[PDB]
Each structure stands twice: as C-alpha cells, then as structure tokens.
Design goal:
The modification Phosphoserine is found at residues 81, 92. The protein has five helices and ten strands; from the N terminus they run αβαβαββββββββαα. The protein is α+β, with helices and mostly antiparallel strands and 164 residues long. The chain has a single domain (1-164), classed as ph1033 like fold (Roll).
Length: 164
C-alpha cells in the first residue's frame, strides 16, 4: 500500500540531488550513503534537524529520469571510510568528504515525462525536474513527486518509521 509511505512523507522536506554519473547513484544505493558539495552539506545538515524526514530525490544528469528517493538518517560525518566515488572534472575527494547515511525508500526509476504536471514553487514554478543539485522542493510538489514513483516492494518502511 501507500499508507506507510505517506506517513513517512508527512511534513517532510525534499531536495533534488543531481549526480553527474550513474556509478555514484549505484554506490549510494548499495551502501546507503551520499556526499555533496559543502554548500549543500550545510543546507542538508540544517534541514535534518528541522524536519521529521528529509527526502533526497535523485536524478543522474542527462538520464531524463529520477533514479529513486531516500531519507536522511544522519547528519554528515567525516572519517568513516573512503567511498570510491567517480569524481568528475574539477570535482575532488576533499569536497565530497562529509558523508550522510540514507535509507532508500524507492530504488525504482521515474521518467521526467511522468512528472511534467508538477511545478516547484521554490524554483519559479518550473517543472520539478529542473533545478541545481540541492534545490529544495516545496512540500506538496515533493510529496506528489514521490507518490508518482512505482512502488518498491523490496523495501519495508517499518524500520524507517522507527528511526523517526
């Protein structure tokens, strides 16, 4: 059903995460971790204390899709393991240093064609697919966006609800 998902999303905050390649999203799905630039790490740390759930919605650049969504389970922490991210041009390992732990809520894809009816008030009402890495997505838009994803029957939200 969708009832536990709706409970998790209640009063949540949502952020668009853009990844330059698929390898880093695969690594995040396998290990339950995400790292971002210091400008966004600061925003996510602030949001984690402010909301019952902080949801990251992932999209690999140029894929035309979202690859799933996850809930922050921790603030960022350093010196836990060297995650073998695929660092793009200009990008380095010292900036991707703060590591957040995340719990995946949906590992299924959603094509942008399916979200064309959702606009984000916090990005000038552009389609929710549009935004820089870290763009906050307003509550109602983000909730409806997550509800569009195919259900991920491999995931039991019972343990997520207990983290809250």
């Amino acid at each position: 059903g969708t009832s536990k998902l709706k409970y998790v999303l209640q009063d949540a905050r949502f952020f668009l995460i853009k990844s330059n390649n698929h390898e880093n999203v695969s690594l995040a799905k396998a290990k339950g971790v995400w790292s971002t630039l210091p400008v966004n790490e600061k925003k996510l740390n602030l949001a984690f204390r402010s909301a019952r759930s902080v949801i990251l919605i992932f999209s690999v650049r140029e894929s035309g899709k979202f690859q799933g969504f996850a809930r922050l389970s921790s603030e960022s922490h350093h010196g836990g393991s060297p995650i073998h991210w695929v660092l793009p041009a200009g990008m380095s390992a010292k900036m991707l240093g703060g590591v957040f732990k995340i719990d995946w809520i949906c590992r299924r894809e959603l094509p942008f064609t399916k979200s064309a009816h959702l606009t984000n008030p916090w990005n000038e009402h552009k389609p929710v697919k549009i935004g820089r890495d870290g763009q906050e997505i307003e509550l109602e838009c983000g909730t409806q966006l997550c509800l569009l994803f195919p259900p991920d029957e491999s995931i039991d939200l019972y343990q997520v609800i207990h983290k809250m």
